[PDB]
């Protein structure tokens, strides 16, 4: 599913991301835009052989099982394919674990490089939330 911007904002909010670990909703929307273009089906290989899955590009090195990432872990206890669903629940639950792991949203390199310190509230402008 390719979410609309405000559609994704609403879903993330319903699932409790707005201000999770202190990160306002626009941070999450911004990260999803640059990670996935709001496409739940996005997958992208990493150099280390792991793969990133879903709207927030959660990797298989630590967080989900894809059966092909040797040496990796599955800390979200889910198949990576669960991160590709129309329903974003599994992605949000797993993101909550990631952002709690000590480095906050810096876990998402694209958030650090493209969202951090910017006017992230712009990502939720106009949305009826
Ligand atoms: Cl915001
Ligand atoms: Cl881009
Ligand atoms: Cl894909
Ligand atoms: Cl992989
Ligand atoms: Cl994801
Ligand atoms: Cl393969
Ligand atoms: Cl594996
Ligand atoms: Cl392994
Ligand atoms: Cl999803
Ligand atoms: Cl933080
Ligand atoms: Na894994």
UniProtKB/Swiss-Prot annotation:
CDD domains hit by this protein: LYZ_C (cd16897)
The protein's role, per its UniProt record: Lysozymes have primarily a bacteriolytic function; those in tissues and body fluids are associated with the monocyte-macrophage system and enhance the activity of immunoagents. Has bacteriolytic activity against M.luteus.
Entry-linked InterPro entries: Glyco_hydro_22 (IPR001916), Glyco_hydro_22_CS (IPR019799), Glyco_hydro_22_lys (IPR000974), Lysozyme-like_dom_sf (IPR023346)
Entry's family note: Belongs to the glycosyl hydrolase 22 family.
Organism of this sequence: Gallus gallus (Chicken)
GO BP annotations, alphabetical order: cell wall macromolecule catabolic process; defense response to bacterium; defense response to Gram-negative bacterium; defense response to Gram-positive bacterium; killing of cells of another organism
Entry superkingdom: Eukaryota
GO MF annotation, one: beta-N-acetylglucosaminidase activity
Localization of this protein: Secreted
C-type lysozyme domain segment(s): 1-129
Record-listed substrate binding positions: 101
Complex and partners: Monomer.
Name the UniProt record assigns to this protein: Lysozyme C
